[PDB]
Design a binder for these strands. Sequence first.
RNA 1: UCUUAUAUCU
Lengths: 308, 321, 308, 16, 16, 16
Amino acid sequence: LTRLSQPGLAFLKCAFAPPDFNTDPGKGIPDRFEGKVVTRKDVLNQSINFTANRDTFILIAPTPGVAYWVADVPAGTFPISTTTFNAVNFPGFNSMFGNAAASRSDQVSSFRYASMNVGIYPTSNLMQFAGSITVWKCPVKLSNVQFPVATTPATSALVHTLVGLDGVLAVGPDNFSESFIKGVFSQSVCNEPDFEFSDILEGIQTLPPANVTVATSGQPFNLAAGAEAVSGIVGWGNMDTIVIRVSAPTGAVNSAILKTWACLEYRPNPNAMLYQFGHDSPPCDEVALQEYRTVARSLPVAVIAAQN
Amino acid sequence: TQTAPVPQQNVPALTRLSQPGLAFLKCAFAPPDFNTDPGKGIPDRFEGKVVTRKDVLNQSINFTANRDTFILIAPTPGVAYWVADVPAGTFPISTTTFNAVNFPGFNSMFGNAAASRSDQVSSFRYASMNVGIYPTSNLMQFAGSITVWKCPVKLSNVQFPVATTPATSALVHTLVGLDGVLAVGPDNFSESFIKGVFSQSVCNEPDFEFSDILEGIQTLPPANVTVATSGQPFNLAAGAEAVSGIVGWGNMDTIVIRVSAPTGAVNSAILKTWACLEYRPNPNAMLYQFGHDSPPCDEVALQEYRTVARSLPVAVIAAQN
Amino acid sequence: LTRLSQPGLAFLKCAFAPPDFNTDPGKGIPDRFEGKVVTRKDVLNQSINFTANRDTFILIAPTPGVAYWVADVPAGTFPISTTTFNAVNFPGFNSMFGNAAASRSDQVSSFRYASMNVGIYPTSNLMQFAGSITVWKCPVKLSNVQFPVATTPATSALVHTLVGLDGVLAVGPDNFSESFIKGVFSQSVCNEPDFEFSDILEGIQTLPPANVTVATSGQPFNLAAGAEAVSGIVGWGNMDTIVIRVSAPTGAVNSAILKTWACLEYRPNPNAMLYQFGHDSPPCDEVALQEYRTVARSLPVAVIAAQN
Amino acid sequence: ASMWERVKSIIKSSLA
Amino acid sequence: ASMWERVKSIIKSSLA
Amino acid sequence: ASMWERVKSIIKSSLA
RNA sequence: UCUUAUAUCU
Ligand SMILES: [Ca+2]
Ligand SMILES: [Ca+2]
Ligand SMILES: [Ca+2]
Ligand SMILES: [Ca+2]
Ligand SMILES: [Ca+2]
């Protein structure tokens, strides 16, 4: 493929087949910008036993620093307004985003996603597993909600709110489902015509933020990054969210290796100590950029872990 | 002379351009000519899941004598136009308040409550936005002129300190660029009312990105925010939640039309407006059913689009639509 | 270069060599957008006496209307939490943005930066001067901070915040340093893959906002536009802030002329009086756009004054 | 005549 | 196959 | 040298 | 790889 640039081609690689190489090729987004950046390749490997007779919901969202968001519910049900998704961080979070709700941008200021994958590698033997895996994607964007509050001068509140989480409550005609033992592999893709830099947000530990009701936010349910010294919502990139629903009957022993990948381009702060690891985003690769979009529209919602 | 027919529809070389490419320009500058809307999507770099909504409004409208009626065709998903009239010879004042007229299928699409707006669609992006006024008056009793101009009204924020005992600082939504409605813009179209008009808008950005759905906005300025605080020249009320609302603000210059009927005028017209949107459908929504992929990059459709729009008069008379 | 377009060539000229033409050739950005626009060619010339035994920090940020932000500190010291950068406007601000915090868009609604250059031309004599000039660019962006206040009905607050100002706290690894009497000329470049329009913001005089601790904003310091009839922060462009640190030892007699250029494309409002001066943005010039990026890339972070 | 008629002609002119 | 061997083929399709 | 003199050189080489 | 719906164009 002697039309693609060295990096145009590494892009495609990191983008769609991370697990197929000894070490991650990814080397930045071959678009027009060629500013100073630091490409970070977050990987999370996790041994996990899906709780029996429950429906585990995993969300692979474009929230820098956190690998996935999980929650479980009574089998056959979906997250209700009372449900809270908890965050599972990729290694190195604090080293990257601090440990205070308002120190998110000490090291880095903005970021853009170049990749986001997930794979489930069943580990149970042929006599113990039972359940299925279902995947679907959803355009959840981070918008705002404006509502009058009854303070004294008498205000009007404008706060952050996730829009599109409503599509978590149902498996659409565009899904992948199959026996748990088969495992899965999936990728997300840029949900915008271009690849722009997203700003780092400050002080979001939970969404809806505290002292705002779910119902006010308009979110079907809520996401909590938890304690500020442990994790946080530092942003929300331009990728569709990947919904994974693991289902397991009682008596089943369903275990797997959860693996997540996310390649991103960060704008290093000259004061940050990760700066000297920086580089320039690579030059425009018209062919890679095109081939990216068509390959994207050509793949299935997901595939079994045997072809990954 | 006399009045132009009314476009009826759905009544049962140029090769360099891709198929979806052509259908895009067609919908973008002249929808009234086709029996059916050719539109499929925006032939740009994005090839994701979208449902291309085709909004059309057929609105009977009487322009009341001895007033200037102001019509705003703004990129607010679900509502076709914002109207208001003032004393003849004047413009909107802080006191003025534009009420919204919806495209059919609003609640079906955006719900019946202010925080229910993104239950089925998470974001959108305009492909086209056109208006057409077809006068239905007799050539003996009409009077007045029609004037079109376009403003680059964008949706920003207003940061202002409040007198809350812990004591705070506010940030609320505010329309920037609305003072444009306050004067006939130099680049405008003006003609006898009994001649109608038909004008269009184009994307006001070098590309076509997705705007997010906005929750809980009914009036703008929002309640408990005065019109002086927000720094706006007037208001935009969408009414009751159950009725309408402002669910977003796309990247299209808003079209301003001012009808001006002197006293003793009998001015009535058929208002028709078209807007083609590309939405991001939610797996839980039924429209999800009708989703398709946005068409692929048509570099020629995309450049031609830019040049055609720049070669067209700000407005044209009906007869020539 | 007659492979390039006329308007395309100018774009490059204003973008990189403003001081070289007997008249600003810049005539708009040669990208896809071709709508109405008035171009503003902001130039500020200012004699400046750097205080001795102090490090003076200048910031050329993409804030329409103000030429730069200044502040000084104890020599060999960086700006602390209690520091306050003060705005210095380009001539004719009130004419473009009024004299009231919520009356910034009467004339203009939007704007995009075509260029932003800075120049220091020392005027001290070769026996009094002492010290140096150090330049580094930072990717500061205007983001938001969310924090629960304690008002009675009790609310969650969302307010403007600058992310990436922590970069002003150290000399960036990529920088220009040299004798004071050698002067400097530096230029900034768009910090996004493209050139999108940015909105005019209302009611902003100081970031951190009023009635907000520098500590909750998560900002290392405080940018003050000052009195609303004088200046204001009307928007945050997509260019890296050029940070200049002049540094006069004790007994130094350091004086210069601080020139500062910024060429913009605004969206004139039909009611504005500057409207009749507008034209259309020049049409796409793929070559101009491409070379804009590589030129930017092959230039030093800054150059001594005699090389501009 | 029509808007599309005019648009069509314009497109043709620009393409050739 | 493998995902890169699937991807590789797609690219070879529309590059041909 | 001057600036333009610097950017011209560059630009001439990336077009050859 | 030919017949069938339909949408396209000089
Ligand atoms: Ca863009
Ligand atoms: Ca909802
Ligand atoms: Ca954008
Ligand atoms: Ca105003
Ligand atoms: Ca900070």
